[PDB]
Amino acid sequence: ETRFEKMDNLLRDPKSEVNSDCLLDGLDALVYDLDFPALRKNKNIDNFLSRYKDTINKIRDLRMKAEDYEVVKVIGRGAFGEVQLVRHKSTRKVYAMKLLSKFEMIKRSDSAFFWEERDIMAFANSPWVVQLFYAFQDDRYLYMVMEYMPGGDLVNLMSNYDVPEKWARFYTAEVVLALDAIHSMGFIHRDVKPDNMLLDKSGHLKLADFGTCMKMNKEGMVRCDTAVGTPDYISPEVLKSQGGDGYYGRECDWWSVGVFLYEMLVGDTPFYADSLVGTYSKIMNHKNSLTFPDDNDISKEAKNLICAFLTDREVRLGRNGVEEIKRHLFFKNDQWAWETLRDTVAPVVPDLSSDIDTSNFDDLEEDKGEEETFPIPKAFVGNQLPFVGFTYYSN
Amino acid sequence: FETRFEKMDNLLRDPKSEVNSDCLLDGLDALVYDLDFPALRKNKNIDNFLSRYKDTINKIRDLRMKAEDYEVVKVIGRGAFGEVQLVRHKSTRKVYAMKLLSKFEMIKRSDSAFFWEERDIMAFANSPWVVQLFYAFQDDRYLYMVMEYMPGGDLVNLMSNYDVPEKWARFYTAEVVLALDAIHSMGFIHRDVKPDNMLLDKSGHLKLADFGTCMKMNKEGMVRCDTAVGTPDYISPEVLKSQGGDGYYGRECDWWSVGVFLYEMLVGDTPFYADSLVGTYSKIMNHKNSLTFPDDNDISKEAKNLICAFLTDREVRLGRNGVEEIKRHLFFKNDQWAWETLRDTVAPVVPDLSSDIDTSNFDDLEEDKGEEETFPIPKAFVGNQLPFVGFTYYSN
Numbered sequence: 001e002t003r004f005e006k007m008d009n010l011l012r013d014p015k016s017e018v019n020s021d022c023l024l025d026g027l028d029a030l031v032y033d034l035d036f037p038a039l040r041k042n043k044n045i046d047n048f049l050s051r052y053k054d055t056i057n058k059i060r061d062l063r064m065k066a067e068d069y070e071v072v073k074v075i076g077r078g079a080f081g082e083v084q085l086v087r088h089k090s091t092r093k094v095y096a097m098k099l100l101s102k103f104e105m106i107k108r109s110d111s112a113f114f115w116e117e118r119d120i121m122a123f124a125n126s127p128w129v130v131q132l133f134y135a136f137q138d139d140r141y142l143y144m145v146m147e148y149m150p151g152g153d154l155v156n157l158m159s160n161y162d163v164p165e166k167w168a169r170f171y172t173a174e175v176v177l178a179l180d181a182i183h184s185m186g187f188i189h190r191d192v193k194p195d196n197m198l199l200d201k202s203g204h205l206k207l208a209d210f211g212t213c214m215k216m217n218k219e220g221m222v223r224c225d226t227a228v229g230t231p232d233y234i235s236p237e238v239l240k241s242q243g244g245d246g247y248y249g250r251e252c253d254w255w256s257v258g259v260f261l262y263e264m265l266v267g268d269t270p271f272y273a274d275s276l277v278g279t280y281s282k283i284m285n286h287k288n289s290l291t292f293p294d295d296n297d298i299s300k301e302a303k304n305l306i307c308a309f310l311t312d313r314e315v316r317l318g319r320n321g322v323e324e325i326k327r328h329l330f331f332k333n334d335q336w337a338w339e340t341l342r343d344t345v346a347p348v349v350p351d352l353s354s355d356i357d358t359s360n361f362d363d364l365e366e367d368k369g370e371e372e373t374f375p376i377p378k379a380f381v382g383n384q385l386p387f388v389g390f391t392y393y394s395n
Numbered sequence: 396f397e398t399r400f401e402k403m404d405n406l407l408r409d410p411k412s413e414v415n416s417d418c419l420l421d422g423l424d425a426l427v428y429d430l431d432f433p434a435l436r437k438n439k440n441i442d443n444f445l446s447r448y449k450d451t452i453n454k455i456r457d458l459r460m461k462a463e464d465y466e467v468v469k470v471i472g473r474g475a476f477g478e479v480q481l482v483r484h485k486s487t488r489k490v491y492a493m494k495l496l497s498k499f500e501m502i503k504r505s506d507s508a509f510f511w512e513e514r515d516i517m518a519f520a521n522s523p524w525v526v527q528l529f530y531a532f533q534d535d536r537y538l539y540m541v542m543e544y545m546p547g548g549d550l551v552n553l554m555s556n557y558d559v560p561e562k563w564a565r566f567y568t569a570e571v572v573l574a575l576d577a578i579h580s581m582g583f584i585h586r587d588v589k590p591d592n593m594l595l596d597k598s599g600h601l602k603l604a605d606f607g608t609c610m611k612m613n614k615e616g617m618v619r620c621d622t623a624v625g626t627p628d629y630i631s632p633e634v635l636k637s638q639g640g641d642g643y644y645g646r647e648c649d650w651w652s653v654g655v656f657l658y659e660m661l662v663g664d665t666p667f668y669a670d671s672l673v674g675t676y677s678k679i680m681n682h683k684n685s686l687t688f689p690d691d692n693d694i695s696k697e698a699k700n701l702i703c704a705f706l707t708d709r710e711v712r713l714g715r716n717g718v719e720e721i722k723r724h725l726f727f728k729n730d731q732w733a734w735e736t737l738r739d740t741v742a743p744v745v746p747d748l749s750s751d752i753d754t755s756n757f758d759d760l761e762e763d764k765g766e767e768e769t770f771p772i773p774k775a776f777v778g779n780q781l782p783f784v785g786f787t788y789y790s791n
């Protein structure tokens with residue numbers, strides 16, 4: 001009323017853009033961007049930087065930093081960064097940490113995916129979406145510290161098991177509940193593949209966005225990478241929007257399920273080609289290019305769900321509703337129910353060992369360059385600005 | 396015993412902290428103010444960023460303490476970086492004194508850093524001997540400092556209207572002494588305290604003000620700087636050399652001011668006074684000779700002694716071994732008070748007042764009625780706001 005209350009309701013509360021973490025990101029961002037020999041030729045800047053020297057050194061120290069965390073495995077690697085499995089050093093607790101690279105991400109692929117990425121995992125409030133516990137940053141990377149997924153991604157699964165239409169019905173189902181959850185928030189998940197499908201201790205499936213692609217050495221070519229999503233799982237419309245023709249919606253994730261389901265059943269991707277161009281071309285050509293072998297079993301109805309997803313946009317299933325998707329005869333069984341599901345017992349329940357247990361995860365390079373960032377300015381470019389307020393806490 | 400999370404939470408809650416809630420506001424406000432010109436918005440990073448926070452800082456600037464909080468009464472001085480104004484808080488209706496510093500003038504003159512110890516001393520001192528800072532804040536154009544009104548006027552007004560008995564002299568000099576020791580014990584030095592910076596409150600007792608020139612001590616209790624000044628009359632010999640780059644100087648520089656203040660209350664003139672900057676400067680270096688006392692004026696044998704002892708070379712100067720060799724001075728012996736009861740005792744002048752609004756103990760002034768100067772619209776990023784960020788402070 002007399003307004004020192006009006007004020008400080010903004011001062012601290014999470015969705016206010018003046019919440020303390022924004023303010024700290026602010027002073028911290030300004031400082032990174034101010035501190036440079038060319039810019040210090042400005043007495044104002046130089047003197048500001050001198051007074052704030054010590055006090056921001058301590059800020060960087062007291063706020064959550066990467067060295068607060070011990071790195072166990074680097075599991076998966078991106079164009080824009082990587083995912084590591086980490087352990088907090090004092091709490092001894094396990095997380096999966098995504099490093100987004102500020103440079104590669106702001107730069108010229110642009111596409112600025114991070115607000116969306118972040119906001120989803122933090123506020124989804126869903127069993128189906130992996131949780132964002134903390135986010136922080138420094139002058140190079142963003143860091144999302146998300147809830148840990150002790151089972152593998154589904155890539156590991158398919159590696160060990162030939163997958164029965166039973167399991168294949170089950171995972172597609174949780175993915176469907178995962179996809180509406182996100183869509184209900186107005187978000188396009190926008191890259192959906194076995195790699196982002198994760199399994200908790202119950203062998204129940206959660207959805208993520210990670211460091212990604214495949215493999216070393218360019219044979220059994222595993223080409224992947226590029227810019228957005230992944231080559232195998234993209235839509236014709238996502239291709240065409242790059243691209244530069246049209247614009248694509250959440251319809252794109254359903255195409256992806258179609259492809260994912262083709263992979264568990266057939267053991268291969270629908271559009272897989274030697275090169276990525278042979279792959280992009282097949283996809284535009286999906287009408288002619290999409291085929292099955294024979295292909296017993298592959299139940300009629302699964303070939304039908306697949307072809308429902310793998311069609312052109314506005315005729316494709318799930319454009320009218322996720323409802324239309326569940327009615328599909330392919331989900332027909334007495335095992336579980338749509339609203340019950342995650343209560344039911346999952347095909348694969350991972351064999352424990354310890355909290356660390358790494359076997360559901362690989363070992364990687366752990367090497368090299370500290371690759372490029374934001375070349376050193378001769379004037380003030382405010383490159384750290386666009387990430388202000390990205391630091392986030394558990395409450 | 397304190398987890399890092401906490402230190403930071405506490406760090407945002409402390410007025411003495413520069414990272415606290417208001418400070419980071421100033422910081423963000425700054426970036427907005429200095430980053431926003433159509434030329435700079437040509438950058439997407441900047442442009443995108445302004446549009447995001449822009450309006451929301453206008454939410455802050457309105458509910459911030461702002462100039463409009465305060466109804467201006469009389470102008471109680473003009474210090475060439477701005478003016479002191481007697482003000483009323485339009486809501487609490489509590490009555491304060493408020494100093495104003497042009498952001499533009501300083502930036503023009505460099506001279507952008509001197510107000511930190513001035514606010515630092517006034518807010519944190521918690522002393523009967525020091526004018527208190529209730530608030531500090533800014534808008535684009537100026538700073539503001541809101542202080543406790545000191546209704547009795549300064550010593551220059553007093554000395555003008557009275558012939559000063561050595562007992563009055565003892566009193567005032569004594570409160571100045573304690574006032575200086577308060578500031579010394581924070582670790583500052585007044586660096587030219589003069590009777591202008593000596594103010595009297597409702598009851599007739601004394602407090603120090605206008606702390607801008609204060610220098611924060613370090614190791615050996617010394618300091619130095621190139622800094623441009625005005626009014627040499629009260630300034631020590633070592634402090635004068637300290638421009639020109641000669642040497643360092645201590646807090647013994649402040650004790651000099653006291654022998655000058657003492658000589659000036661009894662004598663009616665300054666000891667080194669002259670019609671020039673040079674004559675006074677040189678009169679000062681020449682203090683061994685230049686210092687004399689009138690025929691017409693018979694001042695007590697230990698009153699001269701006190702003046703003389705403050706008025707010597709730094710290494711021989713009273714105050715150098717402590718504040719106690721001072722208090723223990725024969726000029727300080729007397730039946731009417733002892734050091735400890737001294738603010739609890741009765742003033743030689745208690746001001747009789749018509750209001751809380753009485754201007755009658757100061758000189759009267761009005762305004763420019765004249766132009767105000769703008770920071771030009773900048774080419775690149777400039778940062779003329781940066782030196783003022785963190786200047787916001789409140790009291791609770």
Ligand SMILES: O=C(NCc1cccc(O)c1)Nc1nc(-c2ccncc2)cs1
Nearest residue numbers: 473474476477478492543544545604605
């Ligand atoms: O703040 C000053 N300095 C005088 C001045 C004026 C304008 C611009 C300047 O750069 C300097 N002396 C002080 N006087 C008080 C005070 C408190 C209560 N009642 C009367 C005066 C505080 S600081």
